Design a protein around this ligand. Structure first.
Ligand SMILES: CC1=C(/C=C/C(C)=C/C=C/C(C)=C/C=C/C=C(C)/C=C/C=C(C)/C=C/C=C(C)/C=C\[C@H](O)C(C)(C)O)C(C)(C)C[C@H](O)C1
Ligand SMILES: CC1=C(/C=C/C(C)=C/C=C/C(C)=C/C=C/C=C(C)/C=C/C=C(C)/C=C/C=C(C)\C=C/[C@H](O)C(C)(C)O)C(C)(C)C[C@H](O)C1
Ligand SMILES: CC1=C(/C=C/C(C)=C/C=C/C(C)=C/C=C/C=C(C)/C=C/C=C(C)/C=C\C=C(C)/C=C/[C@H](O)C(C)(C)O)C(C)(C)C[C@H](O)C1
Ligand SMILES: CC1=C(/C=C/C(C)=C/C=C/C(C)=C/C=C/C=C(C)/C=C/C=C(C)/C=C\C=C(C)/C=C/[C@H](O)C(C)(C)O)C(C)(C)C[C@H](O)C1
Ligand SMILES: CC1=C(/C=C/C(C)=C/C=C/C(C)=C/C=C/C=C(C)/C=C/C=C(C)/C=C\C=C(C)\C=C/[C@H](O)C(C)(C)O)C(C)(C)C[C@H](O)C1
Ligand SMILES: *C/C=C(C)/C=C/C=C(C)/C=C/C1=C(C)CCCC1(C)C
Ligand SMILES: *C/C=C(C)/C=C/C=C(C)/C=C/C1=C(C)CCCC1(C)C
Ligand SMILES: *C/C=C(C)/C=C/C=C(C)/C=C/C1=C(C)CCCC1(C)C
Ligand SMILES: *C/C=C(C)/C=C/C=C(C)/C=C/C1=C(C)CCCC1(C)C
Ligand SMILES: *C/C=C(C)/C=C/C=C(C)/C=C/C1=C(C)CCCC1(C)C
Ligand SMILES: CCCCCCCCCCCCCCCC
Ligand SMILES: CCCCCCCCCCCCCCCC
Ligand SMILES: CCCCCCCCCCCCCCCC
Ligand SMILES: CCCCCCCCCCCCCCCC
Ligand SMILES: CCCCCCCCCCCCCCCC
Ligand SMILES: CCCCCCCCCCCCCCCC
Ligand SMILES: CCCCCCCCCCCCCCCC
Ligand SMILES: CCCCCCCCCCCCCCCC
Ligand SMILES: CCCCCCCCCCCCCCCC
Ligand SMILES: CCCCCCCCCCCCCCCC
Ligand SMILES: CCCCCCCCCCCCCCCC
Ligand SMILES: CCCCCCCCCCCCCCCC
Ligand SMILES: CCCCCCCCCCCCCCCC
Ligand SMILES: CCCCCCCCCCCCCCCC
Ligand SMILES: CCCCCCCCCCCC
Ligand SMILES: CCCCCCCCCCCC
Ligand SMILES: CCCCCCCCCCCC
Ligand SMILES: CCCCCCCCCCCC
Ligand SMILES: CCCCCCCCCCCC
Ligand SMILES: CCCCCCCCCCCC
Ligand SMILES: CCCCCCCCCCCC
Ligand SMILES: CCCCCCCCCCCC
Lengths: 230, 230, 230, 230, 230
C-alpha cells in the first residue's frame, strides 16, 4: 500500500471517489433550495453519484491491495445507476406529459441491458457475443426511444429549457455511454479480438464514470436552475 | 480475499447492500417534500431499508471472509424489519379509521412469527417443525387479517389510492414473503423434503430481501404521491 | 470471529445495536414534524438511543473478539443515558409548571446513583455493599419523587395525556429499571448471593436496555402525537 | 486490547468521547428551533464539541493500544477549540454592540496562548518556563479583558440574560481553565517541578475537557432559550 | 506507530484534518440561515473543505505509517478544489452580471493549470520545467483576469461588499497560492535546482492548505453576512 507516482490507475480511483463524494453532497444539499416539483430529479442525481462514491471507495482500496480491477465488479454499481439515469428521462418529461408507461419501458430496457451484459462477462463467457448482442439491442432501443421515439416528441412539444436538457442528455447517452460497449468488446473473447482487445480501460472507466455521472446530474441541476430563474 | 467472477452470492451481497443504502437515502431525503400526514409512513419505509443496509454490510464482509452465510444470522434484521413492515398497514389505514388495536395485533403476530422462527432455526432445531408450525400459524393470521379481516374492510371503505396500495401490499405479503417459509423448510430437518435445487437460497434471499423491502416502500411512497397530487 | 447459532449473547448484541440505531434515526428524523414546544423532549429521546447505539457497537465487537462483557464497561453508557432519561421528567412537566429545581434534583440523584454504582463495581469492590446502599438510596429517592413527590403532583394537576405519559414512565422506572440493581447484587460479593439462575445476565441486559431506552422514547413520542392531534 | 476495571483513564476516555459526541448532536440538531440571530452561537458550540469528539475517538484508541497519552497530542484539539470558545464572547455580545476589533483581539490572544504553550511542550522544552510565561501573559490578558475590560462593560450595559451568561462564562474561563496551566507546570521541567511536578492529570484532563466544553455550550444554549421564551 | 513530539509534520496533518472537517460542518450547517441567492456560494465553500478534510484524513494516516508524503498525491485534492475555488469568482459576481463564459474560462484555466502540473510532477519529470511553464502561464492568465480583466471590471462596477470580497480573494490567489509553484520548483529537477531544491514543504503545505481553503470560504461567508444585514 505504498503509493507510486506512475500508478495512474491508482490516481484516477482516488480522484473519482472524491469527485463522486463531493457531487453527491452538492445534489443532496441543493435539493431544498428548489420548489418541490424539481426536488425528485435532483435527489435521484445525488443517489446516482452516492452509489458510485461508495463503490469507488471499495474499488480504490481493492486496487491498492491487489493491483487488479475485474470488470465484472464494476457491474455492482452499473446495474443500479444506469436504470436510475434512465428514470431521469421520465422525471424531466413528466411536466411535458410523459406517462408511467415510459418509465417502465426505460427501466425494463436498462435492466435487461445491464443484466445480459453481466451474464456475458461473468456467468457465461462462452456465449459473450450472444449476450453482447442482447445487450446491444437493448441499448439501441434506448437510443432510438430518446432520439426519435415518444420521449423525443414530448421533449420537442415542451420546448425551451426541457428540450435543451433532453438534447444534452441524448448526447451523453450516445457518446458518453459508448465507452462501455467498446470496453466489453475489448475485454471479452469473441469475433472482436481481431479489432479490439488487449486495451487497458481502467483509466478510461475511472474518468468516464465521473464525467458520465456528474455530467448527467449537472445537466438536470442546470434545468431546475434555468426554470426557477424564470 | 480476491473477488471471483463466478461468486454470484458474493455479487448479490454487494448489490443488495448498495440498493438498500440508496433506498434508505431516497426515503429519508424525500420525507420533507410531503405534508406531515404522510411523513411517518415514509420515515418507517426508510428505517426498514436502513436496518437492512447496515446488516447487509456486515453479511457482505462476512461472506468475503468465510464464504458462509448462516441463515440464523439473517434474523438479526428480520426480527426488526418484519414488524416495521406490519406497522405500515396501520400507518396507511389510520385515515380510514384504523385503531391502535390493529397496530398491536399486527406487531404481536409479526414478533411471534419471527421469534418462533428463530427458536426453530437456532435454539431448538430438534423441534423445528413445531416451531415452524407456530410461526406458520402467525403468518396465516396476518395473511387472513389483511386479505379478509378488519384491515381489508377499512381499505375497502376508504377506496381509491389507499385500497390500491393495500391490495399491492397484500400481494407482496402473500407472494413475496413466501420465499422465507420455503427456505426454512429447505434448510431444517422435519417432515418436509422441500428440495428446491439448482438455485442457491443465498442468491434468492439476497435478491428477495431487496425486492421485498424496496418494493414495500415504493408502494407506500407511491400512495403519498398519488394523494398529494389530488 | 465465526458466528455460532447457540451464541444468544452474540445475537442480542447485534439486535440491540440495530434497534438502537434505528430508534435514534426515528426520533431525530421525526423532530421537525412537531411544534417547537415538543422538539426538545424528542431530541433527547434520540440522544439516549444514539449513545446506546454507538456503545453497543463497541460492545458487540468486543464480544465477537473475546467472548466477554465486563459489567463495568456498560457504565460508559449508563452514566450518560440515565441522567438524560431523568431529565425527560422535567421536559414533559415543564408545561405543567415544573421548575429547574426539579431538573437539578433529578440530575443530581441520577448521577450519584450511577457513579456510586461504578465505585462499587470497578474501583472499590471490597465495599460493594456500601456503595450499593448509597446507590440504592438515590434510586429510592428518585422513585419516591416521581410516584409521590412534587413531580407526581405536577402531573396530576396537568391531567390528560401528560398524566398518562407520567404514569407509564413511572412504571418503566419502577419495573423496567429493577433489573440493574438485581444484576449488581448477582455479580458483586456482599450479604446477597442472589441466584437468579437459568438466564444469562448479558441476554437480560441486552434485551432490557433496548426495551428500557426505546420504550421511554416511544412514550415521549406518543405524548407529542396525542397532544398535537388536539 | 482487553479492558481492565482499574483503568480509570481508559474509562474516562470512553465516557468523554461519548459525551462530546452526544453534545455535538444536541447543538447541531437544536439550531433550527431558534431565530436566525441565535443560530451561529449554537452552531459554534457544536463545532467545539465536534472537534473534541473526533479527537477523543483517536486518543481513546491510542490509549487502548499503548497506554500512553502524550500531552502535546491534546493540543491538536486545543489550538482549534480554545479560539472558538473565545469567539463565543463576541457572538453573545454582538447585540450589545461588540465590534470585530474585539473578535480579532480574542482570536489573537487565544492563538498566541495555545501556540506558545505548544512550543514550550513539544519544540523547545529547554525554555519551557519562558514559553510558559508568554502563554501565561496571554491568558491573563484574556481574563482581564472579560472580567474588567471592554467586553465586561458591554455585558453590563446590556444587562439581563446576556450579563448573566457573560458572568457564568467568566467563571468557566477563570476556574475551569486553570487546570491547563497547572498541568503544564506539573509536566514540564522548570522552577515549578518541586511544587507541581509528578502529577497524573489524564483523568482530570478527560473529565475537565468534557465539563469545560459542554458547560460552555449549555450556557450559550440557555441564553438563547431565556431570550426566546420572553 | 507511536507519536513523537518532534514530528511537526505529523502534528500539522492532524490539525489540518480537524480544521477542514470543522469548516465543512460550519458552511454546510450555515447554508439554511441565508436567502437562496447566497446558498450556492456557501455550499461550494463547504465542498472545498469537505474534499480536503477527507483527503487529509488519508494523508494523515499514510504519514503515520510510512513517514512519507509524496507531493503527487496532494494533487488528488488540488485537481478538484482549485477549480471549485475559481468557480467562486463566478458565483460572487453573478449578481454584477458575470456570464457563463467567465465560468468556463476560469474552469478551463484552473484545470489546465492543475493537470499540466501533475504531468510535470508524476508522468514526465524529464520535462518538468516545460510542464511547469505551461502551468505557470495558466496561473498568470487567471491572475490577470481577476486583477485587471473582465472579472475585475464587474467587481468594480458592483462596488460595495462585492468589490471588497473580490479584492480579498485576489490577494489570496496572488499571495496565498504562490507557495504551490514555489514548492514545485523546490521539488522538481530543472534550471531552478540552484535557487530552490532541498526544502521541506510538508509543514508549509499543511498549514497553507488550511489557511487557503478556510480563508477563501470565510471571505465568501463574510460577504453573505454583510449583504444580508443590509
Ligand atoms: C443493590 C443494593 C441495594 C439496592 C437495592 C435495590 C435498588 C433493589 C430494587 C428492587 C426493585 C426496584 C424491585 C422491583 C420489583 C418490582 C415489583 C415487585 C413490581 C411489582 C409490580 C406490580 C405488582 C404491578 C402491578 C401492576 C398493575 C396491577 C397494572 C398495571 C401496570 O402499569 C403494568 C404495566 C405492570 O401492567 C440494597 C439492597 C439497598 C443494598 C445492597 O447492599 C446493594
Ligand atoms: C513553476 C515554474 C514556473 C512558474 C512559477 C510561478 C508562476 C511562480 C509564481 C510565483 C508568484 C506569483 C509569487 C508571488 C509573490 C507575490 C508577492 C511576494 C507579493 C507581495 C506583496 C507584499 C509582500 C506586500 C504587500 C503589502 C500590502 C499591504 C498588500 C497586501 C496585504 O497583504 C493586504 C491583503 C492587507 O492588502 C516558471 C518559472 C514559469 C517555469 C519554471 O520551469 C517552473
Ligand atoms: C457490445 C457488442 C455489441 C453491441 C455493441 C454496441 C452497441 C456498440 C456501440 C458503439 C457506439 C454507440 C458508438 C458510437 C459512436 C459515435 C460516434 C463516434 C460519434 C462521434 C461524435 C463525436 C465524437 C462528437 C461530436 C459530434 C457532434 C454532432 C457534436 C455535437 C455537439 O457536441 C453538441 C452537443 C453541441 O451538439 C454487438 C456489436 C451488437 C455484438 C457484439 O458481440 C458485442
Ligand atoms: C414453515 C412451515 C410451515 C408453514 C409454512 C408456510 C406458511 C409456507 C407458505 C407458503 C406460501 C404462502 C406459498 C404461497 C404460494 C402462492 C402461490 C403459489 C400463488 C402463486 C401465484 C399466483 C396466484 C399468481 C397470480 C395470480 C393472479 C390473480 C395474478 C397475480 C399477480 O401476481 C398480481 C399482479 C395480481 O399480483 C408449516 C407447513 C405450517 C409447518 C412446517 O413445519 C414448516
Ligand atoms: C504557565 C506558567 C505560568 C502561568 C500559569 C498560570 C497563569 C496559571 C493560573 C492559574 C489560575 C488563574 C488559577 C486560579 C485559581 C482560582 C481559584 C482556585 C479560585 C477559587 C475561588 C472560589 C472557589 C470562589 C468562587 C466560585 C466558584 C469556584 C464557582 C462558581 C461561582 O461562585 C458561581 C456564583 C458562578 O456559581 C507563569 C507562572 C506565568 C510562568 C510559569 O513558568 C509557567
Ligand atoms: C454510470 C455508468 C454508466 C452510465 C454505464 C453504462 C454502461 C452501459 C451503457 C453498458 C452497455 C453494454 C452494452 C450495450 C453492450 C455490452 C454490455 C454492456 C453492459 C457493457
Ligand atoms: C425483509 C424481510 C422479510 C419480509 C422477511 C420475512 C420473513 C418471514 C415472513 C418468515 C416467515 C417464517 C414462517 C412463516 C415459517 C418458518 C419460519 C419463518 C420465520 C421463516
Ligand atoms: C439505559 C440504562 C438504564 C436505564 C440503566 C439504569 C441503571 C440503574 C437504575 C442502576 C441502578 C443501581 C442501583 C440502584 C444499585 C446498584 C448500582 C446500580 C448503578 C446498578
Ligand atoms: C477545550 C480545551 C480548553 C478549554 C483548554 C484550554 C487550555 C488553556 C487555557 C491552556 C493554557 C496554557 C497556559 C495559560 C500556560 C501554559 C500553557 C497552556 C497552553 C497550558
Ligand atoms: C487548496 C489548494 C490550492 C489552492 C492549491 C493551488 C495550487 C496551485 C495554484 C498550483 C500551481 C502550479 C503552478 C502555477 C506551476 C507549477 C505547478 C503547480 C500545479 C504547482
Ligand atoms: C455531509 C453531506 C454528505 C452527502 C453524502 C456524502 C457521500 C458519502 C460517500 C462516501 C464515500 C466514501 C469515501 C471515503 C473514503 C474513506
Ligand atoms: C474525474 C473527473 C471529474 C469531472 C467532474 C465534472 C464533469 C462535468 C461534465 C460537464 C457538465 C456540463 C453540463 C452543464 C449544463 C450545460
Ligand atoms: C432496478 C435494479 C435492478 C437490479 C438488478 C440486479 C440483478 C442482480 C444480478 C443477478 C445475478 C444472479 C446470478 C445467477 C447466475 C447463475
Ligand atoms: C447525506 C445523505 C446520506 C444518507 C445515507 C442513508 C443511510 C445509509 C447508511 C447505510 C450504510 C451501510 C452501507 C455501507 C457499505 C460500506
Ligand atoms: C420489535 C420487537 C423485536 C423483538 C426482538 C426479539 C429478539 C429476541 C431473541 C431472543 C434470544 C434469546 C434466546 C435464548 C434462549 C436460550
Ligand atoms: C440485489 C437486487 C436488487 C434489486 C433492486 C430492487 C428494486 C425494487 C423494485 C421493486 C418493485 C417496485 C414496485 C412499486 C409499485 C408502485
Ligand atoms: C442517517 C440517518 C440520521 C440519523 C442516524 C443516527 C444513527 C446513529 C448511528 C449509530 C451507529 C452505530 C451502529 C452502526 C453499526 C456498524
Ligand atoms: C433486543 C431488541 C429489543 C427491541 C425492542 C424494541 C421494542 C421497544 C419496546 C416498546 C415499548 C412500547 C411502549 C410504548 C407506549 C406508547
Ligand atoms: C452529567 C453526566 C455526568 C457523567 C459523570 C461521569 C463520571 C465518570 C466516572 C469518574 C471516574 C473516576 C475515576 C476513579 C478514580 C479512582
Ligand atoms: C427550548 C427549551 C429547552 C429547555 C432545555 C432544558 C434541558 C436541555 C436538555 C439537556 C441535554 C444536553 C445534552 C448533553 C449531552 C451529554
Ligand atoms: C446528527 C449529528 C451527529 C453529530 C456528530 C457526531 C460526532 C461523531 C464523532 C465520532 C466519535 C464517536 C466515536 C465512534 C467510535 C467507533
Ligand atoms: C467524562 C465526564 C463527563 C461529563 C459530562 C458533561 C456534563 C457537563 C455539564 C456541566 C455544566 C452545566 C452547565 C450550566 C447550564 C446553565
Ligand atoms: C455535520 C456535518 C459534517 C461534515 C463534515 C464531514 C467531514 C468528514 C471528513 C473527515 C473524517 C474524519 C477525519 C478523521 C477520522 C478518523
Ligand atoms: C495546520 C492548520 C491550521 C490552520 C487553521 C485554520 C484557520 C485559518 C483561517 C484563515 C483566516 C482568514 C480570514 C478571512 C476572514 C474575512
Ligand atoms: C455533450 C458531450 C458529452 C460526451 C461526454 C463523453 C465523456 C466520456 C469520456 C471518457 C474517456 C475519458
Ligand atoms: C468543476 C465544475 C464543472 C461543471 C460546472 C457546472 C456547470 C453548470 C452548472 C449549472 C449552473 C446553472
Ligand atoms: C404486484 C405483485 C408484487 C409481488 C412481488 C413478489 C416479489 C418476488 C420476490 C422475488 C424472489 C426472488
Ligand atoms: C408498561 C410497563 C413497562 C415496564 C416493563 C419493562 C421491563 C422489561 C425490561 C426487562 C426485560 C428483560
Ligand atoms: C404515536 C402513535 C403510537 C406510538 C407508540 C408506538 C409503539 C410502537 C412499538 C414498535 C415496536 C417495533
Ligand atoms: C460556575 C462555573 C464553574 C466551572 C468550573 C468547572 C471546573 C472544571 C474542571 C474540573 C476538573 C475535574
Ligand atoms: C447529563 C445531563 C447534563 C445536563 C445539564 C443541564 C442543562 C441545563 C440547560 C438549561 C436550558 C434550558
Ligand atoms: C489577505 C490574504 C493574504 C493571504 C495570506 C496567505 C496565507 C498562506 C500562507 C502560507 C502558509 C505558511
Amino acid at each position: 500500500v505504498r503509493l507510486a507516482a506512475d500508478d495512474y490507475v491508482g490516481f484516477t480511483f482516488f480522484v473519482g471517489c472524491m469527485a463522486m463524494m463531493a457531487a453527491s453532497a452538492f445534489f443532496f444539499l441543493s435539493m431544498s433550495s428548489f420548489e418541490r416539483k424539481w426536488r425528485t430529479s435532483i435527489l435521484v442525481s445525488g443517489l446516482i453519484t452516492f452509489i458510485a462514491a461508495v463503490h469507488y471507495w471499495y474499488m480504490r482500496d481493492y486496487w491498492s491491495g491487489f493491483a487488479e480491477s475485474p470488470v465484472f465488479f464494476r457491474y455492482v454499481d452499473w446495474v443500479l445507476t444506469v436504470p436510475l439515469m434512465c428514470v431521469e428521462f421520465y422525471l424531466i418529461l413528466k411536466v411535458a406529459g410523459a406517462k408511467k408507461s415510459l418509465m417502465w419501458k426505460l427501466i425494463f430496457l436498462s435492466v435487461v441491458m445491464l443484466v445480459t451484459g453481466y451474464f456475458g462477462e461473468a456467468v457465461d463467457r462462452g456465449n459473450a457475443w450472444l449476450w453482447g448482442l442482447f445487450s446491444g439491442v437493448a441499448y439501441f432501443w434506448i437510443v432510438i426511444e430518446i432520439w426519435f421515439g415518444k420521449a423525443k416528441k414530448l421533449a420537442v412539444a415542451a420546448g425551451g429549457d426541457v428540450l435543451a436538457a433532453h438534447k444534452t442528455l441524448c448526447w451523453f447517452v450516445l457518446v458518453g455511454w459508448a465507452i462501455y460497449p467498446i470496453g466489453y468488446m475489448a475485454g471479452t473473447p469473441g469475433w472482436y479480438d481481431s479489432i479490439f482487445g488487449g486495451w487497458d480501460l481502467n483509466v478510461i472507466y475511472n474518468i468516464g464514470d465521473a464525467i458520465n455521472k456528474i455530467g448527467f446530474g449537472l445537466v438536470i441541476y442546470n434545468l431546475a436552475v434555468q426554470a426557477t430563474n424564470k
